[PDB]
């Protein structure tokens, strides 16, 4: 039955491709061509955050749009007050090889991990006056590339072993294991309502997972190389991916297919991070050519360039209120653009 | 600023003070990446190593330097995490000369690390291990069992020179040096070789990129 199953799988792939083609009545660039362009967007740095002595790998905004957490290879995880550029907390790590970090939506906990293969969760609002490790979540057999909190008790992580997992922080055990990728998983993005998430991997594909059921509902393909960053569109019906093809792509969840490709002939450098503005009109992406481009998400025009870094831009994010964009790079600085 | 903001600033300054102190303490270490074939002997390259599965970090002290050796084996997944070691001062590469079956694999590994975009100018310290077995094995399996494209004596000195030449042939950038050293399983004089190679490496890097 092995050949029959292989033929059935190929027939199903053809059926899916034909279904996707049938729905492609028009593309985004043929609909939005009548909308006034956003024009040139010129942003300036308003704050520079200094203190790390090594490459910064991850950065995440809190839900108050004022505090942010960053992690670097010097063994520190630092919580910053973005309005005054004060350091609020500095957490030493047991392993300096940190890939990701996260800031709980309540502001009570932070999390990070990397090569150790352990996701550590730190309790910030503690008695005794000092930040301490609350949990160490072990179970993955590869590096942790991304982790995001759903609530103070649930965290979802992505690993280098091709698996994603939903963890119960208090129990310390995995609750849901998400399998189906072939390559390592590089990025994770939660839906606005926490019910779904999208993961990107080195298979040049992304999968949409149902947090409660554990199954993959959709698989999106189109990139030629590894996908390093995924971000949901603010309304939850679309997401953008960045890859080593020097291309970003906007995918629609309802049409089950790619809607827009963001590329330029003068860009031959990879994409390290993606994000959207509060309204969804601007798409931001960090590149390993030491700058960050701002794209018009509806026309695929380049709206502007942020270019204050001396090394690879490793991370970026946008505040929940849309007031500012923060970036981090391998030059050990963070910058806030507005 | 209010009284609470002044106190917050004082806290921030104490945080910065401790961050600088830790940066200084960490700035005295020499970071070495350790790569090699399975069972190459890399785990015993230095008899003084302490261990303190992901990355296995070992360390030792010698003279007035603190050496931190990172074994990368646990991450059986690599370009996705190798750039974390871009700033290592040197790469130690271990080759087992006795086991012919592990060769070619070790040549592909050497070529891959030598031409990695993040290690194009990072020097390599190449250790050829178990010469005490190779020198006897060669009298029964005279190299051609492993490197059939060889025209030469079936002797210890010439087979060793040929293997070293094969490893050095993978260096395609004039800005990188490869150091070679022959060791025995019972040879304890490895800390001196690493120390001297690192000293020459740091000097060369101080002069190159200085516009010399």
């Amino acid at each position: 039955e092995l050949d029959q199953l292989r033929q059935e799988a190929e027939q199903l792939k053809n059926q899916i491709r034909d279904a996707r083609k049938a729905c492609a009545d028009a593309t985004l660039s043929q609909i939005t061509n009548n909308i006034d362009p956003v024009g040139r967007i010129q942003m300036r740095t308003r704050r520079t955050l200094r203190g790390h002595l090594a490459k910064i790998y991850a950065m995440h905004w809190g839900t108050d749009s004022r505090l942010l957490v960053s992690a670097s290879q010097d063994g520190k995880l630092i919580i910053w007050d973005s309005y005054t550029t004060n350091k609020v907390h500095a957490i030493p790590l047991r392993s300096s090889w940190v890939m990701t970090c996260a800031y709980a939506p309540s502001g009570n906990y932070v999390a990070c991990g990397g090569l150790d293969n352990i996701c550590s969760i730190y309790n910030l609002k503690t008695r005794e006056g000092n930040v301490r490790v609350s949990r160490e979540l072990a179970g993955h057999t590869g590096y942790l590339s991304c982790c995001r909190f759903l609530d103070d008790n649930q965290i979802v992580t992505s690993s280098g072993d091709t698996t994603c997992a939903l963890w119960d922080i208090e129990t310390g055990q995995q609750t849901t294991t998400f399998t189906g990728h072939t390559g390592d998983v590089m990025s994770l993005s939660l839906a606005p309502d926490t019910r779904l998430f999208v993961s990107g991997a080195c298979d040049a594909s992304a999968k949409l997972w149902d947090v409660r059921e554990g199954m993959c509902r959709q698989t999106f393909t189109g990139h030629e190389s590894d996908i390093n960053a995924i971000c949901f569109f603010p309304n939850g019906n679309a997401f953008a991916t960045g890859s080593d093809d020097a291309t970003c792509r906007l995918f629609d969840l309802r049409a089950d297919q790619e809607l827009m490709t963001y590329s330029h002939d003068n860009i031959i450098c990879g994409i390290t991070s993606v994000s959207f503005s509060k309204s969804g009109r601007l798409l931001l992406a960090g590149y390993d050519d030491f700058n960050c481009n701002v794209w018009d998400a509806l026309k695929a025009d380049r709206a502007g360039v942020l270019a204050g870094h001396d090394n690879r831009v490793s991370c970026l994010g946008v505040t929940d209120d849309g007031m500012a964009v923060a970036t981090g790079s391998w030059d050990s600085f963070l910058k806030i653009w507005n | 600023l209010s009284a609470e903001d002044k106190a917050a600033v004082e806290r921030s300054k104490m945080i910065e003070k401790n961050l600088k102190e830790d940066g200084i303490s960490a700035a005295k270490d020499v970071k070495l990446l350790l790569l090699g074939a399975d069972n190459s002997g890399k785990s015993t390259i230095v008899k003084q190593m302490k261990i303190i599965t992901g990355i296995v970090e070992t360390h030792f002290t010698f003279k007035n330097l603190h050496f931190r050796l990172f074994d990368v084996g646990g991450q059986r997944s690599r370009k996705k995490w190798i750039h974390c070691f871009e700033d290592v001062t040197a790469i130690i590469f271990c080759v087992d000369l006795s086991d012919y079956n592990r060769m070619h694999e070790s040549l592909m590994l050497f070529d891959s690390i030598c031409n990695n975009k993040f290690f194009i100018d990072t020097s390599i310290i190449l250790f050829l291990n178990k010469k005490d077995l190779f020198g006897e094995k060669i009298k029964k399996s005279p190299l051609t069992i492993c490197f059939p494209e060889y025209t030469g004596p079936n002797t210890y000195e010439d087979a060793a020179a040929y293997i070293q030449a094969q490893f050095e042939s993978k260096n395609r950038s004039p800005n990188k040096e490869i150091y070679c050293h022959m060791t025995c399983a019972t040879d304890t004089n490895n800390a001196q070789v690493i120390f001297d190679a690192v000293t020459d490496i740091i000097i060369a890097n101080n002069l190159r990129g200085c516009g010399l």
Partner: single-chain antibody, 231 residues
Framework: VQLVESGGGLVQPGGSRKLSCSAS????????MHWVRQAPEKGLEWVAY????????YYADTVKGRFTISRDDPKNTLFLQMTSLRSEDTAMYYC??????????????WGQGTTLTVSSDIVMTQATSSVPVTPGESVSISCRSS???????????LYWFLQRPGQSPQLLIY???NLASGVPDRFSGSGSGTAFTLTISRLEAEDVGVYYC?????????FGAGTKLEL
């Protein structure tokens, strides 16, 4: 978290004594420390402050030049060396910890006091000295200040404390509206510049004592006279 006071006792006028607070169960070196005193039948009065790292030291102007405040982090011990003691220095002395960072809650944990017996400022005014109360009642306690406590950074630096009979006071509300950890949601604070209110809904038992207003906008820190509830 524990703070234990020592020293004190009966001293003749003109002498000197050292008070000492032993801290346990917390990262003492990360907290600033305050001394607060309460005259036998009066309200609370601030005495002195040392910031973390001993960078900043402040004194009340009634003790300045006579008292020295110091700390010894390796032994988690705070000291106050008092000279030229006067009959007005008779009081219960409390050691209070505070930590300052964005979102922090200073003056949260107060220790037990020690009893010493000797043989420009913003004025806080309590609306009333005493409010009879009945359990199951809504009680509103209010204060006024001589200067607005609303700063340009958006924060209002008003604190509410409750001193139950026989106990050191505990923090109820910080920055005019932020309920302290461990305090039930029965308490609520509100106000505007120069005018503040504390509302207690569904008053319960062990909810009776003296309520104090404190400003923390600028040193020296001042307290109101205190409003007593009774059943």
């Amino acid at each position: 978290v524990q703070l234990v006071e020592s020293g004190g006792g009966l001293v003749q006028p003109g002498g000197s004594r050292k008070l000492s607070c032993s801290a346990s169960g917390f990262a003492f070196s990360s907290f600033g420390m305050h001394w607060v005193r309460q005259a036998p039948e009066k309200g609370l009065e601030w005495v002195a402050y040392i910031s973390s790292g001993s960078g900043t030291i402040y004194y009340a102007d009634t003790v300045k030049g006579r008292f020295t405040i110091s700390r010894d982090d390796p032994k988690n011990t705070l000291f106050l060396q008092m000279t030229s003691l006067r009959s007005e220095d008779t009081a219960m002395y409390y050691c209070v910890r505070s930590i300052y960072y964005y979102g922090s809650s200073p003056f949260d944990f107060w220790g037990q006091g020690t009893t010493l017996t000797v043989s420009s400022d913003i004025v806080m005014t309590q609306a009333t000295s005493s409010v009879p109360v009945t359990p199951g009642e809504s009680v509103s306690i209010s204060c006024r200040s001589s200067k607005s406590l609303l700063h340009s950074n958006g924060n209002t630096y008003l604190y509410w404390f409750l001193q139950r009979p026989g106990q050191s006071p505990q923090l109820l509300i910080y920055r005019m509206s932020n309920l302290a950890s461990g305090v039930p949601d029965r308490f609520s604070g509100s106000g505007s510049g120069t005018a503040f209110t504390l509302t207690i809904s569904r008053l319960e038992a062990e909810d009776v004592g003296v309520y104090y207003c404190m400003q923390h906008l600028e040193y020296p820190l001042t307290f109101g006279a205190g409003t007593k509830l009774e059943l």
